[PDB]
Amino acid sequence: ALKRINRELADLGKDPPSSSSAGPVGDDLFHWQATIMGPADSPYAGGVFFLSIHFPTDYPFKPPKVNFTTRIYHPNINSNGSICLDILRDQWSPALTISKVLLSISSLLTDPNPDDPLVPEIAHVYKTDRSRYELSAREWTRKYAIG
Amino acid sequence: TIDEGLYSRQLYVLGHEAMKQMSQSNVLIIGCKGLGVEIAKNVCLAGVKSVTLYDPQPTRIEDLSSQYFLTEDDIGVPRAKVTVSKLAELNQYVPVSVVDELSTEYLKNFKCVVVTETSLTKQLEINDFTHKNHIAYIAADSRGLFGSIFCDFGENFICTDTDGNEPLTGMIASITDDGVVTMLEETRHGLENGDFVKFTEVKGMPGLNDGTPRKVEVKGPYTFSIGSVKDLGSAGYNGVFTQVKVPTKISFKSLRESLKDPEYVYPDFGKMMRPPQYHIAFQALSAFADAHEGSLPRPRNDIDAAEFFEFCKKIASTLQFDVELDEKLIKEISYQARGDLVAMSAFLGGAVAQEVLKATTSKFYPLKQYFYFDSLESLPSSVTISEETCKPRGCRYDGQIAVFGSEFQEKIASLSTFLVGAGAIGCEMLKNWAMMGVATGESGHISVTDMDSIEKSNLNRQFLFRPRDVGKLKSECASTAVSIMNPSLTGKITSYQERVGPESEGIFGDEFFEKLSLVTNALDNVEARMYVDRRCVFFEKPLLESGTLGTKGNTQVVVPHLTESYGSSQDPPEKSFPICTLKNFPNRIEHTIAWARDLFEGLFKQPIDNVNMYLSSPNFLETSLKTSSNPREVLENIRDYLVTEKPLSFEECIMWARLQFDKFFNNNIQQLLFNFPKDSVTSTGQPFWSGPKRAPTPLSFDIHNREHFDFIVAAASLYAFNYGLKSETDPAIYERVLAGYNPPPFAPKSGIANKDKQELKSIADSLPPPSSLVGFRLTPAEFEKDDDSNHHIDFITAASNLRAMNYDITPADRFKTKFVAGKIVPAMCTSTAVVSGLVCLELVKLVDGKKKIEEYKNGFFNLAIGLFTFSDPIASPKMKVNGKEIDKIWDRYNLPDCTLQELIDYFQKEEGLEVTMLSSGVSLLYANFQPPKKLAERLPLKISELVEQITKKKLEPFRKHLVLEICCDDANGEDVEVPFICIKL
Amino acid sequence: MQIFVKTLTGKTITLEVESSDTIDNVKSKIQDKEGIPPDQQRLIFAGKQLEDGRTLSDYNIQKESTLHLVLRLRGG
Amino acid sequence: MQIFVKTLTGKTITLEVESSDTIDNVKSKIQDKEGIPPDQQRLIFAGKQLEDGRTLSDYNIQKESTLHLVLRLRG
């Protein structure tokens, strides 16, 4: 638990990811605040999103608990910040690290999946009227993810 | 008409039909010693129609060694007469009677006959009659550290359920023309060869939907075969399959035939050559008793051992057994002939009670036919065991002194144990400790802790409690009961009502733990087990873990400096469903039940708490706005629970329930279908509502439908409870109120700066000031499954069934809904007895202080299939640190409360290791990559001061140590693991 | 060489192995046939719990040997 | 040679392949024709699920064999 978390934190410290920055809040090793930069080739370009990562006691065996804090207009993210992700679930096993999770969330930002949505209205807009979805996502990122 | 308020946990193991058939069976028990009384107790708690006892032998003192319903004031009285009165109180639905004379014909009145402590000739006489009249016959025997069970249920036993597992069900993707059935993605059918399955809701092959079971040929973990379905069609798409369990015909052999060529059941595969020895040994014991006026060999007597061995050789020659007799083991059986241990009695009683339930219910696979068990590794070796020390002293412990001796009895009486929890396992453990005389000496003591209270459903397996004791504290009742059982324990048991955890270290501190001898866990959750395990590891005390689930059980032992800890192994985690599946696209009844639970919590628990907190905190609004992820919904909840939708009568509650029905079962489905029409296709052109996604349909409210009315009643009642109004139940008022309802129009919406703030302010000013509302509070609804008059499970069942009707899912009754929503763990009395027996068999090993790992045993068992297995514990891993051997688990560093810089210098100088990370609790005290200024600030401080500064909380006065975890690197830069540090404050 | 593994729930599994195979390969095969991760598997043979890093020949496991796959229970 | 792949929706896709072609190449062809990512493809022949890193010949696939293609539902 503590040793694994310290190992991952040291590994993150050695090589700056240049696209993510995760570190313990205050001094609590089991509670982290991470920052994700919006992908360049996406509606969320030029945006900074803050995530809260509560760690599990059985880590790496059990999965972490990631939640978005910044409001985002995404088909797979609801208003509570919950993330519909796979490497945060059964697909995940004690073989990957938080850096992988952050990259995966960045990818999910890069291209949403409306076939199995979490916010049906946004998925419907994305499937039917793509331009309206693009405009809404850009406006939401501008007015929430910047400032 | 089964009382579900008492058999709630047992019905999930047996079932309604099983208990219905069980409640019409009579059981006769011959022999009322420890084993007989244990069997009778388990049967009475199980719930058979009646129990009859037959034991005219007068009570002796040594009989108290394992009989917990006998007292020293009952010496000279027949055992049945003095035991029936105490047994009649365990269960009010099970009468208990005593017969003073047994005749063969009388046996025709009973469904099952159990025989203990009876000579072999009488057993043959009884069996010769019970076999040909189709009467189940079970015979049990317990001699010292050895035990035997024999079962004979007739020549035509019919077993409906073989393995005791739920039928397997699954969703099919495609069925080829050759019967090759394929499951959905990453789903395992779990079938075996030769099983039978039946299909439903199959498209393209209607013939398979008739219901005729078909063979199964498992061709892989994801696909199987059923044969040729050429005629019924060409290919089938989608559908569900359910396993069909067929009865089995089991044929038993009579005792007279079975003696010649028995069929053994092996509890341990490590010693497969012993049961052939025990079969001869027990018959030799019976012959010796018959040749010495019913007297067993004297303990540790050489002449009696030689005569017994002569009898064994004579029997081996007579029966043409082609086995070489092991003199040592046989003479060991001879030495312990007069032994009577409570642990073996409990183990065999649990097993035999389970066999009786199998015989009555015609369920599960029974033993076929001989089961010989031993625990000879438990015999002490650190004391003098001879003829002079094992002779009886005329005390109640003679049945145990005859096996262990007087010196080991003194060792036992000086124990200082600590039992965590007072559940079923706790009660059994306390009974065993009282019988064994644990902590009856001058230096002995017992401590038991549990924070729960007795409930009605607990009386089914926690035998120390009575209906008059409902509502009291478990620990007090257990302590008082065991003081009543064994008067020597009066004033030597301490009961606490404290939860064992991080918040109770002020009571169970260093002083408390440094005086113990062993810790025994009787918990029901993994968190508490891990916490107690960590404490025991830190203090280096033996630990005994045990767990049960339905008919399965396991026991494990942790020994300091020898084996690994409880927390060094993993267990399968609980399965949770993805939020997307629960929210919009369910396909199983479990998803609907979880959604109904969430709806209940969100309707009757959270808004009430928000309203109450708003009326309490003078400045709750700012905190809600700047903290809640959805402050506007909080404001809406406050507004519509205070002013807008505040009920003034029960009719308004009924109208609110109708409105909620429309909101959650008619409008959201319409919105979802508007978003994803039934004819929509995915990005790849395939239909959207295909596979695990089922197309829902709106529900139109119809009062005549039962489910709709049930939901309305439950919702209205819960709303009234929240607002504390009188709730009606007569359907006439409901029909009158709901008849005159005009639904508002609803049309799905297609979607399409500072206004939001304006709306928030408008809502805020609309709320009445807290000053205008003083003393007015709303009662939140706290979930409580065990009460059947609060409309909790009723509401959950109604909502779940309605949502199932939305998505075309087969609804579940109230029983299964209660099982799933409440997370009830199936429980049984027999499993508890067996695990307590195994744990108490390991306790005597722990007391003797055995230093070798090949003498301890971890046990696993499943009584449904009659499986037992034992395995040695895993030794604790070793490692090399600074050219020294270090135990990875049980070693630690003892350092003074020195400076952080001094600690780093000490590690660099002595171990030659560079400290890189140092943490305490969940805080990172020191890290190598921190900025130099921060380290220079934190370096010259002591460890206690550093912890106080980082955690921003003072150390408790009772804190006497700190546990620090340190990661360090060697000179070459290669990471090396080191044991934790125990700073002495 | 063919061996049998009996689960605590009554299920039986047949594995095709060789004497030189390590316990890790057996655990991987059991995971493939059941989905149970190797770290959560408890195999018992002749009173000895199999440990990672050793070979079958170390436990004298031969053809038609029977192993038990067990697990711990949280209730009680 | 030529093979046929049938989906859960009754569509049949004809492919020109060779016995030495890897399963990955066939999945790539299926991705090209239908856009289904290879990771989500599950090909079944004679009751056995084709696995990556192998060939059709390993599964004794011969002239005008019929396979079934089922795709997983990502969460």
Ligand SMILES: Nc1ncnc2c1ncn2[C@@H]1O[C@H](COP(=O)(O)OP(=O)(O)OP(=O)(O)O)[C@@H](O)[C@H]1O
């Ligand atoms: N952390 C803990 N510290 C102390 N006692 C505990 C702890 N956790 C659970 N217990 C107690 O352990 C016992 C568990 O036994 P058991 O689960 O059979 O009883 P129960 O929870 O009251 O019953 P049921 O599960 O049938 O509703 C209970 O007395 C419970 O109060």
Ligand SMILES: [Mg+2]
């Ligand atoms: Mg309770």
Ligand SMILES: [Mg+2]
């Ligand atoms: Mg419990």
